[PDB]
Amino acid sequence: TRAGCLIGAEYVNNSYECDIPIGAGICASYQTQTKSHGSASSVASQSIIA
Amino acid sequence: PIKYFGGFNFSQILPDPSKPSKRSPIEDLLFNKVTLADAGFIKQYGDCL
Ligand SMILES: *[C@@H]1O[C@H](CO)[C@@H](O)[C@H](O)[C@H]1NC(C)=O
């Protein structure tokens, strides 16, 4: 992103409010995803989503 | 979707759908004038490579 290189976070096409401002129009948060249909708390990747 | 407000023409201040930055014509003029240091657009300012 224009701010820079983000590691450990996955991009989300949806739009939530900003919790932790990453910069350049990007914000990150800690999210638990049950949409994966497997393990909710332990998602397939790092739980940080931008 | 329509932009008639009794005759008060806000075209110069409302966003321009026919542009990529979607700035208003007055906003476009202002961004073009103040360009001594800022490039006026962020096409390449994101990475500066
Ligand atoms: C209603 O406003 C529209 C613009 O949205 C304009 O074209 C039209 O002349 C107006 N009609 C009346 C009856 O005010």
UniProtKB/Swiss-Prot annotation, chain B:
Residues of the site described as Cleavage: 23-24
Glycosylation sites: 9
Region listing for Fusion peptide 1, in residue ranges: 24-45
Superkingdom to which the source organism belongs: Viruses
Function: Precursor of the fusion protein processed in the biosynthesis of the S protein and the formation of virus particle. Mediates fusion of the virion and cellular membranes by functioning as a class I viral fusion protein. Contains two viral fusion peptides that are unmasked after cleavage. The S2/S2' cleavage occurs during virus entry at the cell membrane by host TMPRSS2 or during endocytosis by host CSTL.
Protein name: Spike protein S2
Location of this fragment in the whole protein: 793 to 841 of 1273
